[PDB]
Amino acid sequence: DGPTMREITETIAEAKKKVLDVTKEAQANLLTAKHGMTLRESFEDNVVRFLNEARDKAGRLAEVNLKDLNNVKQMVMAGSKGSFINIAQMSACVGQQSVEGKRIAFGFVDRTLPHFSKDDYSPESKGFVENSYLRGLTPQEFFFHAMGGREGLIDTAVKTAETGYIQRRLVKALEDIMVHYDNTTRNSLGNVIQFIYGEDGMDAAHIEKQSLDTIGGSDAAFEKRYRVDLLNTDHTLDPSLLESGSEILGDLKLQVLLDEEYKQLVKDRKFLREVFVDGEANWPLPVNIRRIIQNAQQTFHIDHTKPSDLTIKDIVLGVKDLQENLLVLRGKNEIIQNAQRDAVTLFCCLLRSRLATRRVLQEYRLTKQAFDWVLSNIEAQFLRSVVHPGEMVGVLAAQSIGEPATQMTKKVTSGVPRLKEILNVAKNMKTPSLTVYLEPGHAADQEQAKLIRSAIEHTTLKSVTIASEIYYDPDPRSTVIPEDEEIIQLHFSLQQSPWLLRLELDRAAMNDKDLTMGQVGERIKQTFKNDLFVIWSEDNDEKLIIRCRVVAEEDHMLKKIENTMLENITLRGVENIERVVMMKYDRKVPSPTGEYVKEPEWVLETDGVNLSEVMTVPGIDPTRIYTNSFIDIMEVLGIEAGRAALYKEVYNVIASDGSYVNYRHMALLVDVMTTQGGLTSVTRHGFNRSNTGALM
Amino acid sequence: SLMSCISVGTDPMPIITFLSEWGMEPLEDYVPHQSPDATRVFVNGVWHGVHRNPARLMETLRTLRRKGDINPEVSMIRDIREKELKIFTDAGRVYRPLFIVEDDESLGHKELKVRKGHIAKLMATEYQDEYTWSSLLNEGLVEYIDAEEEESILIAMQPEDLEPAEADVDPAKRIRVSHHATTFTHCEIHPSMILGVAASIIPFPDHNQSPRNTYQSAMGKQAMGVFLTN
Amino acid sequence: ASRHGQKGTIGITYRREDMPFTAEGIVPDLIINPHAIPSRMTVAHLIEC
Amino acid sequence: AYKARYRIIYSNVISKNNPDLKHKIANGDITPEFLATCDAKDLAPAPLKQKIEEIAKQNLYNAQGATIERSVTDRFTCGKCKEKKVSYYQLQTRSADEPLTTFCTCEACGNRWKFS
Amino acid sequence: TTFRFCRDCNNMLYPREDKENNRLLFECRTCSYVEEAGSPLVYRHELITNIGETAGVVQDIGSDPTLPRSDRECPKCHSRENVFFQSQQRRKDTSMVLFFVCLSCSHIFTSDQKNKRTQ
Amino acid sequence: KDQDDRDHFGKKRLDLAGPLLAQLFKTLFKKLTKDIFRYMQRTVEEAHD
Amino acid sequence: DQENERNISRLWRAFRTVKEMVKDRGYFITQEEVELPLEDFKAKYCDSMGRPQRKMMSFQANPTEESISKFPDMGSLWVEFCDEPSVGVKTMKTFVIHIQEKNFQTGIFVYQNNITPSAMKLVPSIPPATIETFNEAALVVNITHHELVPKHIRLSSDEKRELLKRYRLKESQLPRIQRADPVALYLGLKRGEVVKIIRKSETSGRYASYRICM
Ligand SMILES: [Mg+2]
Ligand SMILES: [Zn+2]
Numbered sequence A: 001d002g003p004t005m006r007e008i009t010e011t012i013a014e015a016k017k018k019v020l021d022v023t024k025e026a027q028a029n030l031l032t033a034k035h036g037m038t039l040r041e042s043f044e045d046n047v048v049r050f051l052n053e054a055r056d057k058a059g060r061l062a063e064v065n066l067k068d069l070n071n072v073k074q075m076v077m078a079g080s081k082g083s084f085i086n087i088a089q090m091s092a093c094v095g096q097q098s099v100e101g102k103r104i105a106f107g108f109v110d111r112t113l114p115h116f117s118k119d120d121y122s123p124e125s126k127g128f129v130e131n132s133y134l135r136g137l138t139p140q141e142f143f144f145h146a147m148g149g150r151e152g153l154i155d156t157a158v159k160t161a162e163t164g165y166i167q168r169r170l171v172k173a174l175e176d177i178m179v180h181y182d183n184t185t186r187n188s189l190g191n192v193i194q195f196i197y198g199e200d201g202m203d204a205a206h207i208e209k210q211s212l213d214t215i216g217g218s219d220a221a222f223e224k225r226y227r228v229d230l231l232n233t234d235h236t237l238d239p240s241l242l243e244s245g246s247e248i249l250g251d252l253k254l255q256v257l258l259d260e261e262y263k264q265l266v267k268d269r270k271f272l273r274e275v276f277v278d279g280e281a282n283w284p285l286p287v288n289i290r291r292i293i294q295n296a297q298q299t300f301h302i303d304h305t306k307p308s309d310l311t312i313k314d315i316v317l318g319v320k321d322l323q324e325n326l327l328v329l330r331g332k333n334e335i336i337q338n339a340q341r342d343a344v345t346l347f348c349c350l351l352r353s354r355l356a357t358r359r360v361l362q363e364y365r366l367t368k369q370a371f372d373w374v375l376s377n378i379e380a381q382f383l384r385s386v387v388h389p390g391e392m393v394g395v396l397a398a399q400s401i402g403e404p405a406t407q408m409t410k411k412v413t414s415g416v417p418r419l420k421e422i423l424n425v426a427k428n429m430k431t432p433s434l435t436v437y438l439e440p441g442h443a444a445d446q447e448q449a450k451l452i453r454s455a456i457e458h459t460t461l462k463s464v465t466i467a468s469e470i471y472y473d474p475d476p477r478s479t480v481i482p483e484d485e486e487i488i489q490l491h492f493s494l495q496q497s498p499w500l501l502r503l504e505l506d507r508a509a510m511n512d513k514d515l516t517m518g519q520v521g522e523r524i525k526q527t528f529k530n531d532l533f534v535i536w537s538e539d540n541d542e543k544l545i546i547r548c549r550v551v552a553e554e555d556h557m558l559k560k561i562e563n564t565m566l567e568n569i570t571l572r573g574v575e576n577i578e579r580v581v582m583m584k585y586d587r588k589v590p591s592p593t594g595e596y597v598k599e600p601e602w603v604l605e606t607d608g609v610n611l612s613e614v615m616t617v618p619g620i621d622p623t624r625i626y627t628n629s630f631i632d633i634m635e636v637l638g639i640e641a642g643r644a645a646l647y648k649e650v651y652n653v654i655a656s657d658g659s660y661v662n663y664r665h666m667a668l669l670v671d672v673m674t675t676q677g678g679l680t681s682v683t684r685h686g687f688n689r690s691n692t693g694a695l696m
Numbered sequence B: 001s002l003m004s005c006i007s008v009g010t011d012p013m014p015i016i017t018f019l020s021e022w023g024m025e026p027l028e029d030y031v032p033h034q035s036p037d038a039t040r041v042f043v044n045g046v047w048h049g050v051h052r053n054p055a056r057l058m059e060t061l062r063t064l065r066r067k068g069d070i071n072p073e074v075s076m077i078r079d080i081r082e083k084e085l086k087i088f089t090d091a092g093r094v095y096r097p098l099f100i101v102e103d104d105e106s107l108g109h110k111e112l113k114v115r116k117g118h119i120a121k122l123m124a125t126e127y128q129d130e131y132t133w134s135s136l137l138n139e140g141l142v143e144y145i146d147a148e149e150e151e152s153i154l155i156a157m158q159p160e161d162l163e164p165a166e167a168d169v170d171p172a173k174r175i176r177v178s179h180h181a182t183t184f185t186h187c188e189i190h191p192s193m194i195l196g197v198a199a200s201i202i203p204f205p206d207h208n209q210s211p212r213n214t215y216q217s218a219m220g221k222q223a224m225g226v227f228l229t230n
Numbered sequence C: 001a002s003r004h005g006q007k008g009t010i011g012i013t014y015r016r017e018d019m020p021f022t023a024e025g026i027v028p029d030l031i032i033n034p035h036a037i038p039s040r041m042t043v044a045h046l047i048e049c
Numbered sequence D: 001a002y003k004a005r006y007r008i009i010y011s012n013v014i015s016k017n018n019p020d021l022k023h024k025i026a027n028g029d030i031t032p033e034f035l036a037t038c039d040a041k042d043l044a045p046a047p048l049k050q051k052i053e054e055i056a057k058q059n060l061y062n063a064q065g066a067t068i069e070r071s072v073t074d075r076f077t078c079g080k081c082k083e084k085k086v087s088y089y090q091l092q093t094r095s096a097d098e099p100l101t102t103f104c105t106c107e108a109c110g111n112r113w114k115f116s
Numbered sequence E: 001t002t003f004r005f006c007r008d009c010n011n012m013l014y015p016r017e018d019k020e021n022n023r024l025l026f027e028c029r030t031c032s033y034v035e036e037a038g039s040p041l042v043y044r045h046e047l048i049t050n051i052g053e054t055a056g057v058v059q060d061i062g063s064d065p066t067l068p069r070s071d072r073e074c075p076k077c078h079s080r081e082n083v084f085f086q087s088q089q090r091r092k093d094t095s096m097v098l099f100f101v102c103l104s105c106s107h108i109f110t111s112d113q114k115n116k117r118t119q
Numbered sequence F: 001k002d003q004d005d006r007d008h009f010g011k012k013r014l015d016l017a018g019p020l021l022a023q024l025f026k027t028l029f030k031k032l033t034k035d036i037f038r039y040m041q042r043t044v045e046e047a048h049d
Numbered sequence G: 001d002q003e004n005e006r007n008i009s010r011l012w013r014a015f016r017t018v019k020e021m022v023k024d025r026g027y028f029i030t031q032e033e034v035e036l037p038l039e040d041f042k043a044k045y046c047d048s049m050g051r052p053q054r055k056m057m058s059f060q061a062n063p064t065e066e067s068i069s070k071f072p073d074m075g076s077l078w079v080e081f082c083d084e085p086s087v088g089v090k091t092m093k094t095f096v097i098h099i100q101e102k103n104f105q106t107g108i109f110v111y112q113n114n115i116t117p118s119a120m121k122l123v124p125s126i127p128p129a130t131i132e133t134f135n136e137a138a139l140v141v142n143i144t145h146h147e148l149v150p151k152h153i154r155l156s157s158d159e160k161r162e163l164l165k166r167y168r169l170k171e172s173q174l175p176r177i178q179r180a181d182p183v184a185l186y187l188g189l190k191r192g193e194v195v196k197i198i199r200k201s202e203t204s205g206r207y208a209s210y211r212i213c214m
């Protein structure tokens, strides 16, 4: 539209000013950097953010103005081709161009092109393509889009071989893995990788995302859905629900059975809440029970009026019995029988939730034959659902991770290069980071977060110092620097070197990394003990100074002392831990009323790793603390945790690209790297150096 | 790109001989603290000496090139901030020709040396098939600028659109910037010349997504047609 | 291919009678799919035309 | 121791314171015683209290971790938290013949995915 | 700092303490030369530097076409004719403060609305 | 000052047909020069004209 | 007061974890014994200055009724702490013979900073009895309590024999826990000993894996 184009132009126009406004603000030194960022880094972030907010607004304007008759909108609507951005870029505005994440940089001295003035941080100078493809690009817009365009072609080109080799290594490490006739996953050595395929003994094709009802809702809402009380006139099953309704009231013997039923359902709820901590209900499980019920309903032409011919015993026991027939493992012995129970656990919680008495009668309105049929079908389906001995689950898993890696395009190393880091069990990783969760109580307390941030983020005498100076001040009692005259007059009233080491500290720096002259001085004093005489200017006093003296030949001696001071003296924090950011992560937690509710917390984000040390810090949750470096998790928390971290990490790489790979595949890889007792890499060094066959 | 050429490589001596004669103190007699603001002069990464008033020297050297006395393929750059004057007689440097703009105009502002009279003077020679490209080059209307020299210049994209200041607007046309600069040393002959042989057959490449253009400049190489009449 | 990185092979060849036609009696030499254009954002192809 | 215481214271016174111382015285013783214791110183120381107390604040500040701020488009939807508050960023995953992958992120529930 | 050399050698000077009269000297380690110190300051480190900001400000600064202009009235001659640039100290941290150089009086003024300068 | 941009085009040269032949001709002419010398020894020993 | 109280908190936090490990290993320790408050720790093992008296801390522990049912030959344990940050051959020879005379089966030595290589050479000197060295600093936090650390359960000679029988295995074919593994240390697993890991599954709810010691 003509007015939509005016409205778009005026959207860019206002964003263009918003940017100039932040630029004028930055040139006037009024800009205040975000903790753990350059004043400049902070600025560029804002500029980039406004310009994108703009491209999208301008886009969403056109997208709305295009009628349903728009052939492009029509393709986007069906999902046949194209997305929002395509409309936006074509109709309204192309947007900001990036190379290496940052805007077009100054290839020429202080400018992007020779058509610009130096020190031009304007959108037009750093690659913002204001125009739509329909309108056309200016030569500058054209070349910047060309730079940005070339970047993608480079990774498309490279990724292609990197991605290829990743695939090979996964395949060669897993090839010999398959399910044997004992449901055990073993390699060419008969070494057990997984005891049962993908911890459930099921084939992945036969699985579907299903909702575990029991898991969520209020404790009251659960009760209404599941509780049958034949000893209470209000909470009995109405005689409209089943034929025996009238004769069922007050049956103490029967009530014993509904008590077991409800007690199990409550047991299950707690258990599932232990497994899925967030309260996520939707999980991939075999047998779509929802569909079986739906079918029973049309198959049997279920009359949602007349009462059922079911007994409470018919339902209660029927389910109890079906459960014993859901066979994954067959052996006649405690080990194998307990194993069978284990594999079937989760599926049963679902089964018991969907087939509880109240549910079957009130909701499903099933007849005895309908129910009898539903039961047989769950059984049949479940059995068909188990993995087939012979399944080459090894290659499957490798290819199931390999193929998605092939489609791959706080700021942490992710995607293809991270997967590379992971598989290689890379010692010197690119983005090491700790995720420090706070102590239970003080979870919402921002001031507590700051306290730990301060107690953990590394601080050196160097980070606070403006400059150090060596002076010849021969009288320890009287000073050649008239400034210092007052500092002596006090730090004397209420033998040593004539050579003075005088350092000036930055008040602004001494504040962001909260510190006192007293505490800084104390560290130096406590470092050099009784072989260095330290004095310091007060936190109040205008200039921030620390005067130091030792206890023939002394010039070089003091130059060593100043290097020790700047480089080796640690003030606050833990070693290896730099840039600590405070973060308000959202956490799903059960409320007193039962329902899972958003209760966000303050979380710390590290720029480095030291597990052993940060764990022992007061004020954190040492039960919750996580690092992306699984090599550390392994070393500190054992091989079991090493496995859990290694999976978490692998899973993230896939899900970050917005892809889904079934658990089992990632689980298997993770397990194979694990089994040996450590971190066996998917490299010529790791797997290929095991006890397998020589030709292999 | 279409207008790109590569420096054949000339002789440095006529320039070294010229320099010494134009106020260049030889390095052999340099005394850093005596002349401390001295602009250091290089010819092919060889420091030959220093000069006290580079402003005037630079103008003489530029007039030498724009006349033809100093070859047009020779690159000479003056980084004022760094106090350096580097000269390249050197072979292998990629250069492009640009229109020269001069503050020099009795009547008004800073204006492109080339005038509508030269343009008709060329199209007269276009009808003949006496005024060549060399004719524009020796009349110092146009110049050769390599990447190192590009660093110190300031180019206008369009001449007419980027010259006289402001003393309604079509909505269908693309959003364009301005001629805010009063400093303009050069002007772009035509911005489409940034493109190579293959990309120059792409119709409206300013209306395509960046790689779709990169694709065509690869496919057209595999397109059938008459390759030669023989 | 067109001059817009819009490449492809022939899927079928139809005679003039099978082809869709303008009231004016004009028929296409080539039928290209709408699905090319959006994801690709080759606007100049449409303008060329 | 004582011584120381015483011384120282014483010383212181011285210183210055013175015055115171013176016263012482016166015173018572117581114162011382116381111283021783414381221591015383603050108381013791013053009058520093203000500054010393104010200086802590700048340090709180320097302790918080950058907030990735991002837009949400009202024509883009999540697969769980079924809400129209999602962010996206496109990259060139495939060769120059298919163009623009476009990755999504439910800025509220946290799922991510591709469009091709 | 600003250090001296030995007249006679031209070789650099090393500091020596005159233990008796409690005073600093500068000795030459190539000849027998000695001279008393000008300042008590022998070594200055300087971590948070400001020397580099206004570098290469040749009076010819106006002759750079690459430099941008502004209509900001000068603190001295009040001239609305000046070229501008950012802190030439090529560090990451560095603020986006601007330095304006007068196309008449040559005085260097800044845009800093937090602090007041003289360089 | 900033670290030198190893990718600045101004700091790159293009060796065309000229210099390529010059590089080859040098090593090819010194190959001939030192084969004539090997001959001048062979022909001064026996005075073989 | 200063930063003295914090080394106390840490020694107490360490002590709780020692008590936790000991009960876990299969020894008789109460919950109130573990859950001992900080104030109560101070007013027990602190001198006439509130300085930790680690010599007092050292304690003996006996197998639970339940433990002798699974492992009969499971004898008594001795846990010794030390007030000397660096422990040498002098303090070690004292503790070493102490275990041999009191006919102890196992002995843990919780050290502050180090144990000299002189003293470390006396560790495997008195068999069938066994000696363990634990750096106080590791124990401040019980790793077993972590989100990612699942239930490991040590199997008996009969339980192991059965595992291998039930799965038709050679010890080669079992996944392996490394001897030095944080949890293998916490449980004082010996080479050949097997653990049963019970982890939660997004797949099955509960999954049992086994690991043999290195
Ligand atoms: Mg292809
Ligand atoms: Zn969402």
Ligand SMILES: [Zn+2]
Residues within 6 Å of the ligand: E006, E007, E008, E009, E010, E011, E028, E029, E030, E031, E032, E033
């Ligand atoms: Zn001398």
Ligand SMILES: [Zn+2]
Residues within 6 Å of the ligand: E074, E075, E076, E077, E078, E079, E102, E103, E104, E105, E106, E107
């Ligand atoms: Zn002025």
